[PDB]
Amino acid sequence: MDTTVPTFSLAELQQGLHQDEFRRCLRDKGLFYLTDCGLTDTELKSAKDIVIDFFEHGSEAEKRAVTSPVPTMRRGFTGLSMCYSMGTADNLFPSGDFERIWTQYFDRQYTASRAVAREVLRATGTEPDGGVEAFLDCEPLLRFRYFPLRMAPHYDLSMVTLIQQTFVSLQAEVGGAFTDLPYRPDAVLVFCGAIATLVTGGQVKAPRHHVAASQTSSVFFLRPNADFTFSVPLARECGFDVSLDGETATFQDWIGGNYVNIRR
Amino acid sequence: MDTTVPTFSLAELQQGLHQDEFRRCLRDKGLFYLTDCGLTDTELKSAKDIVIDFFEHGSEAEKRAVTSPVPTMRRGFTGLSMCYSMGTADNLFPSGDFERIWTQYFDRQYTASRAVAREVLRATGTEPDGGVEAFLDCEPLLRFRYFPLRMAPHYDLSMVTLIQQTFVSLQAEVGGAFTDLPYRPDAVLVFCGAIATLVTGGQVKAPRHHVAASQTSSVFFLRPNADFTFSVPLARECGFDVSLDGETATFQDWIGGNYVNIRR
Amino acid sequence: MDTTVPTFSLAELQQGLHQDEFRRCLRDKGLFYLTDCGLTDTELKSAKDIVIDFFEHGSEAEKRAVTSPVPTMRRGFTGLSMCYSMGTADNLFPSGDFERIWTQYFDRQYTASRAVAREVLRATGTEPDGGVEAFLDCEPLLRFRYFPLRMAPHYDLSMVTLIQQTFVSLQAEVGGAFTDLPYRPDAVLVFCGAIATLVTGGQVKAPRHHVAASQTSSVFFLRPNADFTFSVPLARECGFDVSLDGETATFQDWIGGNYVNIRR
Ligand SMILES: CC(C)C(=O)C(=O)O
Ligand SMILES: CC(C)C(=O)C(=O)O
Ligand SMILES: CC(C)C(=O)C(=O)O
Ligand SMILES: [Fe+2]
Ligand SMILES: [Fe+2]
Ligand SMILES: [Fe+2]
């Protein structure tokens, strides 16, 4: 088996091309680069520069105004390296220019994430309980980190995670070995998460990955709604060590009352 | 903005003084020293000496008699450095003298914690679902540690946490930088926790803190009851990344079936 | 008190012998070696050799065929050192010979685990809610690790955990000090877990242990069903820091929707 991380054009997938290859990739690797999805180094520059400007030239007062009262990294500024997070609502923006630039950037990320997830579902003949569109109108989280192992091995609990980033620190398990994941100015890196594995009945792999040890990274988590419902027996069938009584359960029943993005 | 950790007299607060300054502190810093609350180095000496005596001169048999069958550090003796924990009931005391001394010490800590939390609620015009007194008649946990980073950065999930302690190891984020928190023989240190943030609708900050690397520390967590109820949309509004279906939820729905005191 | 890790013959226990000594051990130590339970170095050789052969001579393709889409270590092969896991159903076997050998090995482990747990319940006069047999027909997990501190201090959340293994790395807290736990070709090592503490009302200790830093170890967790029910007030009485509203709760209510095997 070739341990090369493949690349797929979103447009070609939506045209019904490379279906066998796509299904194979999802099952055996669970990761791939995605082109023709409206996201490149171009649509990233604007957002990157303005947030970097904020991280470097923003005053403690300005940063305070966009910092949540609890340091959860859900919205606004966070000092972990620095981070800026946002979602579909309840956002914290430092300026009008910043808001316009980041709202557009977030929208493009959310659109691309839903589109590729839509293809993952179609290629596996998966109809989520409640329908595809209700499943995809969810609870995304975008996190931009600035770093002027650096992250332990783990897998994502998202449906899919889109990464842009800017030495190759990011590595993922492929074929049984850690493969480097360099940036592609013309594409976005896609990691399938445990929810893709769960909703498709085990047809999709959620690969482990980590960051080895100055750069920036944009991570977009497409996460299901709390009421997303699934089959308990089926979950057991593909590796989930669930402690759920009954035949069906929700994302909330499984993970709890607070979103958990990664797992070791 | 001045990054000085302020001090407030509990008596003066209860008199309606320094309200604007108190509200400001709660919002921008989330920590402060508290005087005139019935807790000083005097009321600590008795408890400290007797527990230290136990840690140093107690036999393995005597320690066994006050050690829980599961090493949870909820009640009795624990060997992590050593620790002694207690609550409102189901306690484990090694001697009659010990029980009298620590029951009085616990009562003073619980009274002071409820009193300052009462002021936090009043200064923010907060009426918890179910009322103030039902909210404050809760599930406190007192932990005394003896140490004859030493603790990773985190925030507390309590309403408020009171610390006495005895080189300055304790540090908290203030103004965007770690500020030392030395002991005050005449005051107790108060950290606001995530529940203060939650119940007040985001009017209170839960500051991150840690312990840098021989001394003793008394930590009192004022924790809500499992059935404490709050608004889900409001929680989302102040930074909580909740995965809760519906409009209202309980502490148990959010955190789960076991108390969690801190979060990184 | 003697800090020696005792040994009990399962057959002698089932005959009503050494009851006081057994109860004492369960209360003060929570661990012991078990002989005459159908498990020795003999019944381990076959399984060990064949899995070692797989770990060393198995191709990436063969390992892939028995690897779950999510890296949970619940079933099949896992590359953490390597590991092979199995349960009562939904298993992944690389060959017919492997399946026959490991199914028999698993059955012997499950039978021995239920038998000793049955004795733990009898010696403490414990009748689980719903009855003994329903409690023991549960959700076991067997994990075989190959290692051609190595594990932080923790306690198990199982009813009981059986260990075989093959310098003494394994250590447990006994009498207030870490005692080495060498292998016994004629016996299996038994650690009592938090569920034994819980179901017996605090009559059984769940000892902390860890692995100091090439060998193999077989760990069998006898875990309760999600619907196992217990008394909340009683749980509080023996050290469990539960945040459960009401008088009764289930394992799922306490731990959540995913099994958790250990706790620090
Ligand atoms: C650091 C990025 C690449 C990541 O894996 C994550 O945030 O889950
Ligand atoms: C160590 C003390 C100061 C603490 O932060 C805690 O226990 O939460
Ligand atoms: C490593 C083994 C002995 C263990 O303690 C466990 O897996 O819980
Ligand atoms: Fe990740
Ligand atoms: Fe703390
Ligand atoms: Fe263990």
JSON list of C-alpha atoms in Angstrom, two decimals, chain C residues 6-116:
[
{"chain": "C", "resi": 6, "resn": "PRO", "atom": "CA", "xyz": [-0.86, -12.21, 50.10]},
{"chain": "C", "resi": 7, "resn": "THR", "atom": "CA", "xyz": [-1.85, -15.15, 47.92]},
{"chain": "C", "resi": 8, "resn": "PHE", "atom": "CA", "xyz": [-5.21, -16.92, 47.91]},
{"chain": "C", "resi": 9, "resn": "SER", "atom": "CA", "xyz": [-6.24, -20.16, 46.24]},
{"chain": "C", "resi": 10, "resn": "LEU", "atom": "CA", "xyz": [-9.53, -19.58, 44.42]},
{"chain": "C", "resi": 11, "resn": "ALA", "atom": "CA", "xyz": [-10.59, -23.15, 45.21]},
{"chain": "C", "resi": 12, "resn": "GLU", "atom": "CA", "xyz": [-9.97, -22.68, 48.93]},
{"chain": "C", "resi": 13, "resn": "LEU", "atom": "CA", "xyz": [-11.94, -19.42, 48.94]},
{"chain": "C", "resi": 14, "resn": "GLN", "atom": "CA", "xyz": [-14.89, -21.10, 47.22]},
{"chain": "C", "resi": 15, "resn": "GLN", "atom": "CA", "xyz": [-14.74, -23.68, 50.04]},
{"chain": "C", "resi": 16, "resn": "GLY", "atom": "CA", "xyz": [-15.28, -20.97, 52.64]},
{"chain": "C", "resi": 17, "resn": "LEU", "atom": "CA", "xyz": [-11.69, -20.95, 53.88]},
{"chain": "C", "resi": 18, "resn": "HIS", "atom": "CA", "xyz": [-9.57, -17.96, 54.93]},
{"chain": "C", "resi": 19, "resn": "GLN", "atom": "CA", "xyz": [-12.63, -15.68, 55.05]},
{"chain": "C", "resi": 20, "resn": "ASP", "atom": "CA", "xyz": [-11.34, -13.36, 57.78]},
{"chain": "C", "resi": 21, "resn": "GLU", "atom": "CA", "xyz": [-7.95, -13.12, 56.09]},
{"chain": "C", "resi": 22, "resn": "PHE", "atom": "CA", "xyz": [-9.59, -12.46, 52.71]},
{"chain": "C", "resi": 23, "resn": "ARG", "atom": "CA", "xyz": [-11.85, -9.72, 54.11]},
{"chain": "C", "resi": 24, "resn": "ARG", "atom": "CA", "xyz": [-8.84, -8.16, 55.82]},
{"chain": "C", "resi": 25, "resn": "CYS", "atom": "CA", "xyz": [-6.81, -8.19, 52.60]},
{"chain": "C", "resi": 26, "resn": "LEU", "atom": "CA", "xyz": [-9.64, -6.63, 50.61]},
{"chain": "C", "resi": 27, "resn": "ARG", "atom": "CA", "xyz": [-10.09, -3.85, 53.18]},
{"chain": "C", "resi": 28, "resn": "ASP", "atom": "CA", "xyz": [-6.46, -3.02, 53.99]},
{"chain": "C", "resi": 29, "resn": "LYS", "atom": "CA", "xyz": [-4.64, -3.77, 50.72]},
{"chain": "C", "resi": 30, "resn": "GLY", "atom": "CA", "xyz": [-7.03, -4.39, 47.84]},
{"chain": "C", "resi": 31, "resn": "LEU", "atom": "CA", "xyz": [-4.60, -6.63, 45.95]},
{"chain": "C", "resi": 32, "resn": "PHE", "atom": "CA", "xyz": [-3.41, -10.24, 46.06]},
{"chain": "C", "resi": 33, "resn": "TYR", "atom": "CA", "xyz": [-2.13, -13.11, 43.94]},
{"chain": "C", "resi": 34, "resn": "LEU", "atom": "CA", "xyz": [-4.63, -15.78, 42.96]},
{"chain": "C", "resi": 35, "resn": "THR", "atom": "CA", "xyz": [-3.78, -19.45, 42.44]},
{"chain": "C", "resi": 36, "resn": "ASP", "atom": "CA", "xyz": [-5.92, -22.42, 41.42]},
{"chain": "C", "resi": 37, "resn": "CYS", "atom": "CA", "xyz": [-8.03, -20.28, 39.06]},
{"chain": "C", "resi": 38, "resn": "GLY", "atom": "CA", "xyz": [-7.24, -21.97, 35.75]},
{"chain": "C", "resi": 39, "resn": "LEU", "atom": "CA", "xyz": [-4.59, -19.40, 34.79]},
{"chain": "C", "resi": 40, "resn": "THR", "atom": "CA", "xyz": [-0.83, -19.99, 34.79]},
{"chain": "C", "resi": 41, "resn": "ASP", "atom": "CA", "xyz": [2.21, -19.44, 32.57]},
{"chain": "C", "resi": 42, "resn": "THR", "atom": "CA", "xyz": [1.03, -22.54, 30.69]},
{"chain": "C", "resi": 43, "resn": "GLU", "atom": "CA", "xyz": [-2.29, -21.13, 29.48]},
{"chain": "C", "resi": 44, "resn": "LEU", "atom": "CA", "xyz": [-0.44, -17.93, 28.59]},
{"chain": "C", "resi": 45, "resn": "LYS", "atom": "CA", "xyz": [2.39, -19.32, 26.45]},
{"chain": "C", "resi": 46, "resn": "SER", "atom": "CA", "xyz": [0.22, -20.21, 23.45]},
{"chain": "C", "resi": 47, "resn": "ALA", "atom": "CA", "xyz": [-1.49, -16.81, 23.29]},
{"chain": "C", "resi": 48, "resn": "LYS", "atom": "CA", "xyz": [1.72, -14.89, 23.98]},
{"chain": "C", "resi": 49, "resn": "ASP", "atom": "CA", "xyz": [3.83, -16.60, 21.32]},
{"chain": "C", "resi": 50, "resn": "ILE", "atom": "CA", "xyz": [1.24, -16.23, 18.57]},
{"chain": "C", "resi": 51, "resn": "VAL", "atom": "CA", "xyz": [0.58, -12.54, 19.27]},
{"chain": "C", "resi": 52, "resn": "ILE", "atom": "CA", "xyz": [4.31, -11.83, 19.57]},
{"chain": "C", "resi": 53, "resn": "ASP", "atom": "CA", "xyz": [4.74, -13.55, 16.21]},
{"chain": "C", "resi": 54, "resn": "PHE", "atom": "CA", "xyz": [2.11, -11.19, 14.82]},
{"chain": "C", "resi": 55, "resn": "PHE", "atom": "CA", "xyz": [3.69, -8.08, 16.34]},
{"chain": "C", "resi": 56, "resn": "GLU", "atom": "CA", "xyz": [7.10, -9.03, 14.93]},
{"chain": "C", "resi": 57, "resn": "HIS", "atom": "CA", "xyz": [6.30, -10.77, 11.64]},
{"chain": "C", "resi": 58, "resn": "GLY", "atom": "CA", "xyz": [2.91, -9.35, 10.71]},
{"chain": "C", "resi": 59, "resn": "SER", "atom": "CA", "xyz": [2.86, -7.16, 7.60]},
{"chain": "C", "resi": 60, "resn": "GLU", "atom": "CA", "xyz": [1.39, -3.65, 7.57]},
{"chain": "C", "resi": 61, "resn": "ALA", "atom": "CA", "xyz": [-1.48, -5.03, 5.49]},
{"chain": "C", "resi": 62, "resn": "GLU", "atom": "CA", "xyz": [-2.29, -7.84, 7.93]},
{"chain": "C", "resi": 63, "resn": "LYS", "atom": "CA", "xyz": [-2.13, -5.42, 10.85]},
{"chain": "C", "resi": 64, "resn": "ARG", "atom": "CA", "xyz": [-4.38, -2.99, 8.97]},
{"chain": "C", "resi": 65, "resn": "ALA", "atom": "CA", "xyz": [-7.06, -5.66, 8.53]},
{"chain": "C", "resi": 66, "resn": "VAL", "atom": "CA", "xyz": [-7.34, -6.00, 12.31]},
{"chain": "C", "resi": 67, "resn": "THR", "atom": "CA", "xyz": [-7.03, -2.33, 13.22]},
{"chain": "C", "resi": 68, "resn": "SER", "atom": "CA", "xyz": [-10.12, -0.32, 14.20]},
{"chain": "C", "resi": 69, "resn": "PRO", "atom": "CA", "xyz": [-10.89, 2.91, 12.29]},
{"chain": "C", "resi": 70, "resn": "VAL", "atom": "CA", "xyz": [-10.56, 4.88, 15.56]},
{"chain": "C", "resi": 71, "resn": "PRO", "atom": "CA", "xyz": [-7.40, 4.22, 17.66]},
{"chain": "C", "resi": 72, "resn": "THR", "atom": "CA", "xyz": [-9.19, 3.38, 20.91]},
{"chain": "C", "resi": 73, "resn": "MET", "atom": "CA", "xyz": [-7.42, 0.13, 21.83]},
{"chain": "C", "resi": 74, "resn": "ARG", "atom": "CA", "xyz": [-10.81, -1.53, 22.36]},
{"chain": "C", "resi": 75, "resn": "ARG", "atom": "CA", "xyz": [-10.42, -4.23, 19.72]},
{"chain": "C", "resi": 76, "resn": "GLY", "atom": "CA", "xyz": [-7.64, -5.52, 17.49]},
{"chain": "C", "resi": 77, "resn": "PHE", "atom": "CA", "xyz": [-4.15, -4.15, 16.95]},
{"chain": "C", "resi": 78, "resn": "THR", "atom": "CA", "xyz": [-2.86, -0.81, 18.22]},
{"chain": "C", "resi": 79, "resn": "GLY", "atom": "CA", "xyz": [0.53, 0.87, 17.92]},
{"chain": "C", "resi": 80, "resn": "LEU", "atom": "CA", "xyz": [0.99, 3.05, 21.01]},
{"chain": "C", "resi": 81, "resn": "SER", "atom": "CA", "xyz": [5.10, -0.61, 22.01]},
{"chain": "C", "resi": 82, "resn": "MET", "atom": "CA", "xyz": [2.22, -2.58, 20.52]},
{"chain": "C", "resi": 83, "resn": "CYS", "atom": "CA", "xyz": [-1.10, -3.81, 21.89]},
{"chain": "C", "resi": 84, "resn": "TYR", "atom": "CA", "xyz": [-3.83, -6.33, 21.07]},
{"chain": "C", "resi": 85, "resn": "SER", "atom": "CA", "xyz": [-7.29, -6.00, 22.61]},
{"chain": "C", "resi": 86, "resn": "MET", "atom": "CA", "xyz": [-10.46, -8.08, 22.72]},
{"chain": "C", "resi": 87, "resn": "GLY", "atom": "CA", "xyz": [-13.84, -8.52, 24.40]},
{"chain": "C", "resi": 88, "resn": "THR", "atom": "CA", "xyz": [-16.88, -10.81, 24.38]},
{"chain": "C", "resi": 89, "resn": "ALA", "atom": "CA", "xyz": [-17.83, -9.80, 20.83]},
{"chain": "C", "resi": 90, "resn": "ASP", "atom": "CA", "xyz": [-16.91, -7.60, 17.85]},
{"chain": "C", "resi": 91, "resn": "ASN", "atom": "CA", "xyz": [-13.34, -8.91, 17.82]},
{"chain": "C", "resi": 92, "resn": "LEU", "atom": "CA", "xyz": [-10.68, -8.68, 15.10]},
{"chain": "C", "resi": 93, "resn": "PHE", "atom": "CA", "xyz": [-8.52, -11.78, 14.58]},
{"chain": "C", "resi": 94, "resn": "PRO", "atom": "CA", "xyz": [-5.67, -12.10, 12.04]},
{"chain": "C", "resi": 95, "resn": "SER", "atom": "CA", "xyz": [-5.95, -15.88, 11.58]},
{"chain": "C", "resi": 96, "resn": "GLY", "atom": "CA", "xyz": [-8.00, -18.94, 12.46]},
{"chain": "C", "resi": 97, "resn": "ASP", "atom": "CA", "xyz": [-5.25, -20.30, 14.67]},
{"chain": "C", "resi": 98, "resn": "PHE", "atom": "CA", "xyz": [-4.98, -16.93, 16.42]},
{"chain": "C", "resi": 99, "resn": "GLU", "atom": "CA", "xyz": [-8.73, -16.75, 17.04]},
{"chain": "C", "resi": 100, "resn": "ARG", "atom": "CA", "xyz": [-8.93, -20.24, 18.55]},
{"chain": "C", "resi": 101, "resn": "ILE", "atom": "CA", "xyz": [-5.98, -19.61, 20.84]},
{"chain": "C", "resi": 102, "resn": "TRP", "atom": "CA", "xyz": [-7.12, -16.17, 22.00]},
{"chain": "C", "resi": 103, "resn": "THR", "atom": "CA", "xyz": [-10.81, -16.99, 22.36]},
{"chain": "C", "resi": 104, "resn": "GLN", "atom": "CA", "xyz": [-9.89, -19.78, 24.77]},
{"chain": "C", "resi": 105, "resn": "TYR", "atom": "CA", "xyz": [-7.44, -17.51, 26.62]},
{"chain": "C", "resi": 106, "resn": "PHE", "atom": "CA", "xyz": [-10.04, -14.75, 26.92]},
{"chain": "C", "resi": 107, "resn": "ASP", "atom": "CA", "xyz": [-12.65, -17.21, 28.20]},
{"chain": "C", "resi": 108, "resn": "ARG", "atom": "CA", "xyz": [-10.30, -18.44, 30.92]},
{"chain": "C", "resi": 109, "resn": "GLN", "atom": "CA", "xyz": [-9.54, -14.85, 31.96]},
{"chain": "C", "resi": 110, "resn": "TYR", "atom": "CA", "xyz": [-13.22, -13.88, 32.01]},
{"chain": "C", "resi": 111, "resn": "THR", "atom": "CA", "xyz": [-14.16, -17.01, 33.99]},
{"chain": "C", "resi": 112, "resn": "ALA", "atom": "CA", "xyz": [-11.42, -16.41, 36.58]},
{"chain": "C", "resi": 113, "resn": "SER", "atom": "CA", "xyz": [-12.31, -12.72, 36.89]},
{"chain": "C", "resi": 114, "resn": "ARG", "atom": "CA", "xyz": [-15.99, -13.43, 37.47]},
{"chain": "C", "resi": 115, "resn": "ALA", "atom": "CA", "xyz": [-15.11, -16.17, 39.97]},
{"chain": "C", "resi": 116, "resn": "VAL", "atom": "CA", "xyz": [-12.86, -14.02, 42.15]}
]
